[PDB]
Ligand SMILES: Nc1ncnc2c1ncn2[C@@H]1O[C@H](COP(=O)(O)OP(=O)(O)OP(=O)(O)O)[C@@H](O)[C@H]1O
């Protein structure tokens with residue numbers, strides 16, 4: 001098979017005070033990018049290589065004709081005829097021409113067919129419809145485990161699930177435990193589930209596929225399951241890979257007897273997702289990560305030990321994790337010496353990582369209100385109740 | 398106090414004064430880096446895009462063109478009611494998929510004996526004559542199937558179902574390997590048996606266990622497979638499956654999660670085909686069927702006597718059963734030889750067998766966490782603390 | 796000849812015409828229109844049509860055999 | 866093309882009309898001078914709507 005993807009540039013992020021160590025490293029990166037540009041522009045400047053076979057390729061192209069429609073090879077027959085489905089959904093019993101790679105023909109791979117008198121004239125290993133191409137991550141997110149505060153147990157678990165099998169896995173089969181096929185992160189909103197997925201996609205060595213869950217559902221009949229199948233086929237093809245499906249409850253709700261056609265199609269799409277999850281062996285190097293807020297509303301078959309063994313909990317940050325997050329998000333701020341930040345943490349509340357980030361942003365805004373950028377402690381004091389909107393007083397004492 | 402919006406001079410002074418001396422250079426450099434990255438990305442191209450072109454000397458381009466100009470494509474369809482042909486009304490109505498349905502006749506190359514209701518047929522495009530029946534073929538490569546002849550799970554690999562395994566033995570071993578006692582007892586061997594219980598109890602492998610000790614091949618058929626994309630032809634599929642069941646000397650046919658089917662045109666077709674295969678095949682045969690489900694949604698027309706002779710409930714494993722499962726799953730992992738599996742089985746009340754396997758997996762996980770090649774009892778304690786339970790029970794109970 | 800050409804242009808606006816949605820204007824004379832047959836076509840806008848009346852998602856009658864925005 | 870299916874022109878990016886209508890092409894006639902009170906609210910909006918857009922440098 002082919003190899004993974006998601007190329008990223010240098011981490012940099014060693015200096016941040018803009019002390020020309022940043023400038024020197026960035027100038028080195030820019031110099032290398034310049035040599036990229038110049039080298040390829042020179043290579044295209046002189047590169048005469050074409051024709052050669054020509055005639056045989058010309059006549060095979062004439063045989064193929066123009067245009068050529070792509071379909072899905074649903075089934076094969078004796079090695080001259082096959083069953084191919086056009087993107088509309090109609091499949092036909094067609095013939096297979098000699099110049100096709102009989103080894104490449106398998107149920108599922110896209111086949112180039114003749115526009116008139118349909119007949120398999122080619123195989124496309126890179127169909128990758130625009131949607132599933134979009135779901136594949138190209139530029140790694142700039143966030144990383146340095147940006148994540150706390151969640152040390154969560155980071156440990158996610159790395160033990162998706163990284164350790166990717167890196168040296170000998171511990172797994174040495175203990176004989178099958179690697180955890182699939183992991184579901186869950187917790188209250190803005191705890192860091194999507195942030196952890198970003199950090200995983202940063203420090204990665206596999207094709208990362210970001211999905212929205214609600215993205216899978218498609219209007220046309222059978223488009224949903226077909227897209228799910230395409231996504232997982234791309235995952236296997238570019239294995240090792242990580243398939244992140246954020247907001248799994250967009251489809252993961254409890255399965256109930258469908259009545260309307262649309263609900264039947266949703267049930268079909270989830271059934272196909274579950275079937276694809278079961279399809280690949282856990283020994284395979286393709287893992288899935290599903291994040292959600294309403295874990296209690298998920299179907300209790302998606303989270304079966306035979307399908308998703310692990311269940312990572314993302315609890316609201318503790319006081320030490322709260323101060324860790326505050327330190328992280330205040331790194332780029334020019335805080336004064338009067339600020340302590342301890343009063344905000346000590347206040348018994350339900351701050352989250354998102355809440356703390358917003359508190360820092362609003363403190364910066366309040367400082368900008370006073371025409372300053374040093375950000376006093378009073379700025380944080382105001383910002384805390386500015387962003388934290390909304391037990392009867394002395395009932396409990 | 399009315400706060401003042403920033404003015405133009407305010408904005409201009411904010412961007413300066415309290416700035417790092419290298420702001421312009423660094424920001425500009427980052428911008429050029431991003432621009433150069435996009436430049437490289439757009440200019441690097443796509444490359445092949447290499448279509449499935451066979452190596453030369455395998456090409457019969459002359460014959461390929463001959464086929465292109467001679468042979469014709471056929472749309473496939475699911476043939477429906479025969480309209481009682483009797484050689485004078487050979488028309489059938491066929492549904493070409495999401496396209497329409499047409500009442501058509503046969504091509505001269507196919508006899509009506511080859512055409513019957515519910516088989517995929519390839520037909521032309523204007524007369525829509527059924528040109529060739531298209532059996533969906535049978536192979537373990539497609540879908541999932543029995544994919545097993547002599548399972549590697551033995552009677553020592555099953556625990557916690559002693560009464561259940563005994564009942565299963567009476568079901569399958571006694572008529573198959575001891576037909577003489579049923580014959581001279583003058584009693585029909587159990588034609589049908591159902592194995593109901595919560596998922597993860599172990600049901601499947603239990604049958605698989607007896608499938609190894611019944612000296613017969615095991616058959617795994619998933620009801621969701623019958624109800625998912627492999628719907629329609631599935632009837633014919635199981636037809637062929639039942640057909641191959643007849644071919645073999647003895648088949649342990651078992652359907653996984655029949656709830657997906659037991660509770661829908663093609664689904665009903667598969668059901669009635671199952672009814673015909675069971676009620677039609679002679680009960681004296683040796684391909685006895687094992688039925689299991691999680692939701693005792695089964696149609697009333699099924700468990701009528703003569704189709705399901707016995708029912709077996711697979712309850713959650715008991716202390717002895719749970720500790721047996723713990724030991725069984727510990728046999729396959731590197732642990733110490735002094736693990737109190739009775740302790741753990743006590744610590745997992747009302748826990749499914751799959752839950753026990755996951756508990757062992759998490760014990761190995763914790764062992765890996767400390768990078769210890771041998772899992773400890775502490776590791777299993779943390780594993781059960783994590784998996785099981787998903788002050789109150791210690792400050793009141795003692 | 797101008798009279799004959801005007802007659803021909805007017806005749807191209809005869810009936811029947813298929814209804815579609817004026818999705819997007821591309822050039823001064825060509826647009827993208829979503830014909831209610833369920834299909835998007837890159838077609839040519841007839842000159843006499845008031846350009847200011849061409850707003851997105853507006854219902855437009857198109858020639859039956861050419862989909863030209865009539 | 867007609868039925869040859871030959872790429873013969875590149876058109877602007879695909880936006881289906883259902884969202885293409887959601888642009889405010891015809892700006893409404895409502896000024897802050899027509900809004901009584903809400904001065905604090907207007908400032909709080911402006912600190913999020915156009916201040917980040919006009920000058921992200923701060
Ligand atoms: N532990 C943390 N350390 C630092 N920042 C954090 C942490 N947890 C959350 N954040 C901040 O919260 C922001 C939003 O978090 P994220 O997108 O991961 O939410 P989530 O918990 O997955 O919630 P939801 O799925 O409900 O949107 C992140 O951009 C990040 O800045």
Ligand SMILES: Nc1ncnc2c1ncn2[C@@H]1O[C@H](COP(=O)(O)OP(=O)(O)O)[C@@H](O)[C@H]1O
Pocket residue numbers: 554555556557558595596597598599600601602603722725726749750751752754
């Ligand atoms: N009696 C048993 N003996 C051995 N393993 C068992 C037993 N019961 C359950 N298990 C464990 O439970 C897991 C899942 O069982 P499975 O047969 O898939 O459940 P179901 O009966 O719902 O199909 C298996 O991996 C097996 O290790």
Ligand SMILES: [Mg+2]
Pocket residue numbers: 189190191192193194195
């Ligand atoms: Mg999130």
